[PDB]
Amino acid sequence: EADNQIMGPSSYASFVVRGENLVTAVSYGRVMRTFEHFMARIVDSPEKAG
Amino acid sequence: VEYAEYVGAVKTVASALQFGVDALERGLINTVLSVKLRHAPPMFILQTLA
């Protein structure tokens, strides 16, 4: 073997329904993943070529 | 999300409790009106007997 161990993650990368998703959770039942990413895309500079 | 569920449940229980004492207060006015109507002879008797 070229290696005896692989350096991997130690805990689960957490994601819970925080504040800005929770309004859409209660009013719609539509929670998205990374609401902050959508707000950084289509609000602050939607002209940004992804 | 569980906190948002919890505050809604305590709002429901507080609404039911405040509803209970409010319905009891309206019942007090209803009982007062009923006991005053029970000791109430009509107009055409106490227009003369007085």
CA distance B10 to chain A (A): 16
Task: Report yes or no: A20 and A36 within 8 Å, Cβ to Cβ.
Answer: yes
Task: Give the position of tokens 């227009």.
Answer: B47
Looking at CA atoms only, how far is residue B13 from chain A in angstroms?
19
Solved how? Answer: cryo-EM
Q: Is the distance from CB of A35 to CB of B14 less than 8 angstroms?
A: no
Give dist(CA A23, CA A34) in Å, integer.
14
Task: Give the resolution in Å.
Answer: 4.2
Tokens describing residue A26: 């209660």
Amino acid at A32: M
The answer to whether the CB of A13 falls within 8 A of the CB of A20 is no
Q: Is B4 touching A (CB cutoff 8 A)?
A: yes
Q: What is d(CA B5, CA A18) in angstroms, rounded to the nearest whole number?
A: 14
- Look up residue A31 and give its DSSP letter: P
C-beta neighbour count of A17 within 10 angstroms:
16
Residues of A in contact with B1 (CB under 8 A): 16-17, 22, 25
Residue B1 touches chain A, beta carbons under 8 Å:
yes
- Which two three-digit tokens encode residue B26? 């309206």
